[PDB]
């Protein structure tokens, strides 16, 4: 179990850690989060009580270092920092606990949800989408635009998701215009899987990261990317069978975790009706179809 201490909590905030969230009052005695199931990935995120604009947060792996949060009164946000003095960090985290001013990461043993949502997400790939090499953790917020969006304005603050554009030369072989537009298998298998992502694990990892950035920060470009990566698979007549069966599990858990009252903003009606009812893979997403119908029938 790892710990993320907080120096203090000078401003009232809602704090998310992975799929959980809790509230901290202004100047409340709060010194962070204890008992974190070390994993391969976590996210800690913030939405200030006095301004719910800008949700923001940090993706991190407890195995890469000792991280803590300190509020910056000049920039007005909670900042992640790495503590390079391990003896100092151990001194804090064995004491702050000893004072009992930390909240415990509340994991139920039956609940496998965080790893089902982040199975293919890895920090090394996160750090290529969010470029900031001096830190081992990665900052994302509600406003950051994607590289693709920028192409249609600060490259340092962009999300470098893989560009997917169904009406592009990359997606359409000259001489195969109708074929490749109606069946995106070439673009999925040769261009994306074999060429760019190299394997399905990296593809699913970016798909999962995009979903989570959309849900936790309300990042619109991440939502576009999530939907694009689903539609690319579903609109391909030829998809390895291991990929289809795994996709159904991935999407099921994403739909299961989505807030019920956030459906009007996090689910694209066109993409989902196409994937579940029209596409080549309409019959290949049995579990996702079943949760979507019984949880969000109005979208369909």
């Amino acid at each position: 179990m790892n710990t993320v201490p907080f120096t203090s909590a000078p401003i009232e905030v809602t704090i998310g850690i992975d799929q959980y969230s809790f509230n901290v009052k202004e100047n409340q005695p709060f010194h962070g989060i204890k008992d974190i199931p070390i994993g391969h990935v976590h996210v800690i995120h913030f939405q200030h009580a006095d301004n719910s604009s800008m949700r923001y947060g940090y993706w991190f792996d407890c195995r890469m270092g000792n991280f803590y949060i300190q509020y910056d009164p000049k920039d007005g946000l909670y900042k992640m920092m790495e503590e390079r003095d391990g003896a100092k960090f151990e001194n804090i985290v064995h004491n702050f606990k000893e004072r009992q001013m930390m909240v415990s990461y509340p994991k139920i043993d039956e609940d496998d949800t965080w790893y089902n949502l982040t199975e293919f997400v890895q920090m090394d790939k996160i750090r290529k989408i969010v470029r900031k090499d001096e830190n081992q953790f990665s900052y994302v917020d509600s406003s950051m635009t994607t590289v693709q969006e920028n192409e249609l304005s600060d490259p340092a603050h962009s999300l470098n998701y893989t560009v997917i554009n169904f009406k592009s030369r990359e997606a359409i072989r000259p001489g195969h215009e109708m074929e490749d537009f109606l069946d995106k298998s070439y673009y999925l298998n040769t261009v994306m899987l074999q060429g760019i992502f190299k394997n399905s694990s990296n593809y699913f990892g970016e798909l999962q990261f995009a979903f989570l950035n959309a849900m936790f920060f309300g990042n619109y470009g991440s939502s576009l990317q999530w939907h694009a990566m689903i539609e690319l698979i579903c609109s391909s007549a030829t998809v390895p069978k291991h990929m289809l069966d795994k996709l159904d599990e991935i999407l099921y858990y994403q739909i299961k975790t989505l807030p019920e009252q956030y459906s009007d903003i996090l689910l694209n009606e066109r993409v989902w009706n196409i994937c579940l009812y029209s596409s080549f893979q309409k019959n290949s997403l049995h579990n996702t179809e079943k949760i979507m119908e019984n949880k969000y029938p109005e979208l369909l």
């Binding site: 009406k167 030369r169 359409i172 000259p174 215009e177 109708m178 537009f181």
Partner: protein, 237 residues
């Protein structure tokens, strides 16, 4: 963006543009078989690609052999249209290539955009004008060259004959659309109006009769009357 009656005069500026109408590409007759069923038979079709400023019409004849052994022909027809328009553009020198292509039917947008990926500076747009280019096959000489074709063929016409010697492009396009709207609404009566006087001839190299300026005014009135008469008949007005 889409074209409409606000930016209508823009059609006659000096940026080359082409209308593309695909409604006569896939054409069939519907008849009854021997078991009693109903079967279709394709007949030759055409793509109507018209530069509205100069009158130039690139009539690509779609020969029925295109369809042999193919499935989902109404879908294929859109992609075949897009393939041929792209080929036309590619064949042209750069300074003659269109800056914009306006499709009369929105279903043509994605096929044409995909086929035109090599030309990212050519804008592909729909229109909110209801244009009557589906009645192109009511023009006898166009219908005749399409039906007689035995292989794919491109035929060039000036759909304005020599009118631009005397009137503006704007006026010529209005006359063209009036004639075609009348032909679409009551083809036989519209043809009567045009061929009523055997002393006014169609030049071997023209599509329409050689009317004087004052005869065109009369003809246009008669076509407006035909269109309004048919409206009243249809809606009981």
């Amino acid at each position: 963006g889409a074209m409409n009656s606000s930016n209508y005069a823009e059609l006659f500026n000096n940026d080359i543009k082409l209308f593309v109408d695909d409604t006569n590409v896939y054409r069939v007759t519907v008849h009854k078989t021997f078991e009693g069923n109903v079967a279709t038979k394709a007949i030759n079709g055409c793509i109507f690609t018209l530069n509205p400023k100069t009158g130039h019409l690139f009539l690509k004849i779609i020969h029925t052999s295109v369809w042999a052994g193919q499935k989902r022909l109404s879908q294929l027809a859109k992609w075949k249209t897009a393939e041929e328009v792209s080929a036309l553009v590619r064949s042209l020198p750069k300074e003659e290539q269109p800056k914009q292509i306006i499709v009369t039917r929105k279903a043509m947008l994605d096929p044409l955009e995909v086929h035109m990926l090599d030309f990212p500076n050519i804008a592909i747009r729909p229109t909110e004008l209801r244009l009557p280019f589906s009645a192109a096959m009511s023009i006898d000489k166009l219908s005749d060259v399409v039906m007689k074709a035995t292989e794919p063929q491109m035929v060039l016409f000036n759909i304005y004959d020599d009118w631009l010697d005397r009137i503006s492009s704007y006026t010529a396009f209005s006359r063209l659309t009036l004639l075609l709207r009348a032909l679409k609404t009551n083809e036989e009566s519209a043809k009567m109006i045009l061929l009523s006087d055997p002393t006014i001839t169609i030049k071997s190299y023209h599509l329409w009769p050689s009317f004087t300026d004052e005869q065109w005014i009369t003809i246009e009135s008669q076509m407006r009357d035909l269109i309004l008469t048919e409206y009243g008949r249809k809606y009981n007005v």
